[PDB]
Structure 1
Amino acid sequence: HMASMKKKGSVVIVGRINLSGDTAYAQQTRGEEGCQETSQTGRDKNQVEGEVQIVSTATQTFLATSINGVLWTVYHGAGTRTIASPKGPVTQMYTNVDKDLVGWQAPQGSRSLTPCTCGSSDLYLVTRHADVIPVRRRGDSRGSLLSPRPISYLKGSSGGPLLCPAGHAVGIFRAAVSTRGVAKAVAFIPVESLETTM
């Protein structure tokens, strides 16, 4: 009944993938309990840094990537949820279920990737474990792994970036193509798809 109907919590930033120096590595900034309370209130006072955030709901964890002042992630992770912020929950400014895409204004203190204009096909996928995985672009929204690996290694990395050799954003990781549990290829939202959404 309506008196009892509950509301879903916000997406919460719980860490980041540090790409600052010569070594990529994941950092956790909030533990599970603090994530739970922050999801309910939507008020996140934590300092945000970097381009690739690790984000969580009450039931899922995945990635979100800042490009051109928008923090982008996948609809299958975030749904229509708000994101927690110092001032309370922030409503999505982009939602496209047809592309599996959502976006919020990039949180203050984040750094944004620049959209790639290179037209290169030698890409790099960044995972939630801070692995940098070479990917050859094979189409507008897909690329093959140069070194296949079980899908277990890619789970939780949707919303992460595919980058060009110069470090620009080429796309947002959306799905994995697997055979007998081995990921041979990935699908991603191309940055041009974001650039038109913007």
Structure 2
Amino acid sequence: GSVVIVGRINLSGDTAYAQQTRGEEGCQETSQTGRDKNQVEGEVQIVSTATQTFLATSINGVLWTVYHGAGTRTIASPKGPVTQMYTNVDKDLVGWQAPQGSRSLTPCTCGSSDLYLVTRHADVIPVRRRGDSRGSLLSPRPISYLKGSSGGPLLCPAGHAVGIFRAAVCTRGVAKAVDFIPVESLET
């Protein structure tokens, strides 16, 4: 089946919030047909297959997410299932042409090390960047709370895209840091 948009994380106001646009059955039906006519908007989508839910983020006109979420699946669209335009399984990165109605986050030109991770729960978590693909959590979270948030953006103070959340750094059974795909690698 296809990956289906089932919600979004709205980042337009000073406070992020999640919006659900499809329920469980609708998700499963839409995955099977690959036909999705729902209006798209915003930069961060909540996406789901029959068995996994995670995030997708539009940057550079491409809707990006993680391979360990989407596999090589098509995404449901107004015209039926659409094949991936980008697939790098080793980087854990896939992408489709962004849906009409979506907006892309602008890649960060700040070089800021003060980052913010956007989760599927709309928790925007402070993160200190340490390297090209790593930053430390500045507020404690369990691995379990971050699960389902892969594919979500790391933002800089200005709301620019710094990276895509790929994996959590687990130390002594809790989330200590995040591993992310740098926006510089999201080349079209």
Same fold per TM (> 0.5)? yes
User: What are the superposed Cα offsets for residues 84-118 of structure 1, whole Å, 9 maximum, x if unpaired?
Assistant: 00110111110001110000000000111011121
User: What are the superposed Cα offsets for residues 123-159 of structure 1, whole Å, 9 maximum, x if unpaired?
Assistant: 0000000000010111110100011211111000000
The CA distance in 2 between the partners of 1:176 and 1:21, in whole Å, is: 27
Moved more, 174-183 or 85-94: 174-183
The yes-or-no answer on 1:82 pairing with 2:74 is yes
Secondary structure at 1:77 match in 2: helix
Alignment gaps of 5+ in structure 2: none
The CA distance in 2 between the partners of 1:120 and 1:23, in whole Å, is: 21
The CA distance in 2 between the partners of 1:28 and 1:21, in whole Å, is: 17
Count of residues paired in the alignment:
187
The CA distance in 2 between the partners of 1:10 and 1:113, in whole Å, is: 24
User: What are the superposed Cα offsets for residues 33-66 of structure 1, whole Å, 9 maximum, x if unpaired?
Assistant: 0100100000001001110000000100000000
Secondary structure at 1:176 match in 2: strand
Secondary structure at 2:186 match in 1: helix
The CA distance in 2 between the partners of 1:90 and 1:147, in whole Å, is: 38
The corresponding residue for 1:4 is: none
After TM superposition, the score normalised by the length of structure 2 is 0.98
The alpha carbon displacement at 1:181 in A equals 2.3
Secondary structure at 1:54 match in 2: strand
After TM superposition, the score normalised by the length of structure 1 is 0.93
The corresponding residue for 2:38 is: 46
User: What are the superposed Cα offsets for residues 157-178 of structure 1, whole Å, 9 maximum, x if unpaired?
Assistant: 0000001111111000000011
The CA distance in 2 between the partners of 1:149 and 1:80, in whole Å, is: 30
The alpha carbon displacement at 1:179 in A equals 2.0
The corresponding residue for 2:3 is: 11
The alpha carbon displacement at 1:193 in A equals 1.0
- Greater CA radius of gyration, 1 or 2? 1
The CA distance in 1 between the partners of 2:152 and 2:15, in whole Å, is: 17
The alpha carbon displacement at 1:68 in A equals 1.2
Alignment gaps of 5+ in structure 1: 1-8
The alpha carbon displacement at 1:180 in A equals 3.0
The corresponding residue for 2:28 is: 36
Picking from 127, 146, 169, the partner of 2:138 is 146
The CA distance in 1 between the partners of 2:113 and 2:171, in whole Å, is: 23
Secondary structure at 1:159 match in 2: coil
Moved more, 39-48 or 111-120: 111-120
- 4+ aligned runs moved over 4 Å, structure 1: none
The corresponding residue for 1:105 is: 97
The corresponding residue for 2:55 is: 63
The alpha carbon displacement at 1:22 in A equals 2.5
Moved more, 176-185 or 52-61: 176-185
Secondary structure at 1:76 match in 2: helix
